[PDB]
Symmetry: C2
Subunit: 395 residues, 2 copies
């Protein structure tokens, strides 16, 4: 039960770029700026009204990274007196920014919070470690790929994909079932995109092509000519006879979102248009070896706190990190597929780590309204063994 | 604006601070945070099973496991896997900010007991190779970019941190001589306090290699410093400037851990409280003079707590640069006999994420040693912010 009412007054997200694709030259700061500017504009929220900036970002991937939230705030015209915070709850960061914004409003340290999520995975650097203070002749120094090493949880020494294979084994999910889920995500993404279901949320970006400047407004990672036959032919990537392939895992990607939230007092004072109310949220830890299950206790705990049941949810979103991971969650919670990831997910449009939770939230806000539904919950598993969920109510 | 629930410090520890390339260089920021957290758990007789949330400040990701930091710390020190873990970045203020986030969580009843730390390994800051994933142009000038060095410039205003301090020196008419005398005083105060045992209760000693020895003294300090030696140093960034290597804080390695608890938790678990958190405040300011952050931060925090500067028995203003500190002292008319009484970052260094945790932990213990009632700790924040936290000693 939130101590004060907290309302979403704007929600936008960039198109998601493929790894090395159309957005590769924009930093995570840049992408976040683009989403935030679009949100301010779409909500007719004056920057002057923003009291706090909170950005989710996981992997620092530019020379200006440590300043990310502050630079976004300043670039979009929010006053210099407004403070700025960057947070990291890995894959859940896009949802977490909103959770921190809710807390600030609820203890009356803010009235209006810009809560975003962003990631540029294309920009993840190579790191040279241990050479500041001399080297030993004959040592084995790496140009370490900061992205690749970050996709292994060194506490349990598992790649994220292997934590998904664990769930495939535990929940009896076959390779065939994973590929069918992947196909459905592609189909759903395609249907939704072509129907306009991403129009209200989309923050188009001007990009360079060999054809000159163009407006990017469609997700680049999506593969709308996918067939089950093609997916069946892909080899498992991490495990012999495993379930996880390049076709049924989420892609590495670039992207951002921005959700602006406000107290009731602020909505009235500034004549904002509330689009949803934040009803509840929950963060839980879980076993790092099966981190993909995070959404199970996170959704359950959030529902419990809000006094709601899964049957009350018109929409559920569970971030598609890996098909077998998602399917495990579907089976554990007995989710109704007709109301879950209805417009595709990260298998189709990618998983920019910090950005996915902002996109999911922004999508739920607009899609819940489009359907005339009452409640939705968005969630993500989190590398290292956490989960997060946020429940919204249409206004 | 009182905290919605009482929040009490039940443990506060911090590691010795290591010099750049010094005694702690092989320990990751995760390692240092683990050490401080383990020392705090022990000092407060807090069972790891009682901790509901782990929040760690860390600024510059400097190890291959960095994105998982808070989660790994929590798991390594025995906190249950169900307890969630967040890493936050408000640059130089991060060590104070972790505590502020913990207060918020307790106040909205999402936690009862929070482990709130701050950590940095600046020795491990990598060199980054950028823009080589997707091909290079023959004749491009690829750098092994020093991630630390580039992070010490705010690219929004294109100023090294030291140049923002020169701006304050010009604005407030602070001479080079006055900066060097402030620096000498910090070295003298550090030395007197260390030898008197005033860092004993806070210190979380670490076993290091030399054979094995116990490190329990700050390594950056230069206790034979003289005004003449300082007078000979050249200004580093500005012709005839005030900032030198001798009167700026040093790059360093270190961490701290503060455990906070609700009143209910203190009573339920029979904790003995060391201080109560009375208030805090975060403010933005002009990035070109970011060092002035503590002025609105302290003023705002005092306002919210219903206190005045005269009520403070101790004030801490992180010593990022002597002229930056002196600009704060002048703007608020601080009493030097109650401000940075036991030295600061000029003497013992500024591990970005760790300084705010050390300051807090130092105030908790030093306030009790003096028999005082209130103290406020603060830091300027690169990019143009300030943070302050006020404590009250508790019987």
């Amino acid at each position: 039960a939130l101590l004060r009412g907290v309302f979403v007054v704007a929600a936008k997200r960039t198109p998601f770029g493929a790894y090395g694709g159309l957005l590769k030259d924009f930093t995570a700061t840049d992408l976040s700026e683009f989403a935030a500017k679009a949100a301010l504009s779409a909500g007719k929220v004056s920057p002057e009204t923003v009291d706090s900036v909170i950005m989710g970002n996981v992997l620092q991937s530019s020379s200006d990274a440590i300043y990310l939230a502050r630079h976004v705030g300043l670039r979009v015209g929010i006053p210099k007196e407004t403070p700025a915070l960057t947070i990291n709850r890995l894959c859940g960061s896009g949802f977490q920014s909103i959770v921190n914004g809710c807390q600030e409003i609820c203890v009356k340290e803010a009235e209006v919070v810009l809560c975003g999520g962003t990631e540029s995975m294309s920009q993840a650097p190579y790191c040279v470690r241990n050479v500041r203070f001399g080297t030993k002749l004959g040592s084995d120094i790496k140009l370490e790929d900061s992205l690749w090493v970050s996709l292994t949880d060194q506490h349990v020494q598992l790649p994220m994909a292997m934590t998904a294979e664990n769930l495939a084994v535990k929940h009896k999910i076959s390779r065939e079932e994973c590929d069918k889920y992947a196909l459905q995500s592609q189909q759903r993404w395609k249907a939704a995109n072509d129907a306009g279901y991403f129009n209200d949320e989309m923050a188009p970006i001007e990009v360079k092509t060999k054809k000159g400047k163009q407006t990017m407004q469609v997700d680049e990672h999506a593969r709308p000519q996918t067939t089950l036959e093609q997916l069946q032919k892909l080899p498992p990537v991490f495990k012999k006879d495993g379930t996880v392939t390049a076709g049924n895992a989420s892609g590495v990607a670039d992207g951002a979102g921005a959700v602006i939230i406000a107290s009731e007092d602020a909505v009235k004072k500034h004549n904002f248009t509330p689009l949803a109310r934040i009803v509840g949220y929950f963060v839980s830890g879980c076993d790092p070896s099966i981190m993909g299950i995070g959404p199970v206790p996170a959704i359950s705990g959030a529902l419990k706190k809000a006094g709601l049941s899964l049957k009350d949810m018109d929409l559920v979103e569970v971030n598609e990190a890996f098909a077998p991971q998602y399917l495990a969650v579907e089976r554990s919670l007995d989710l109704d597929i007709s109301k879950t990831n209805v417009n595709g997910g990260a298998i189709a449009l990618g998983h920019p780590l910090g950005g996915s939770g902002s996109r999911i939230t922004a999508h739920l806000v607009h899609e819940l309204r489009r359907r005339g539904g009452k409640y939705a919950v968005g969630s993500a598993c989190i590398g290292g063994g956490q989960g997060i969920a946020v429940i919204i109510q249409s206004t």
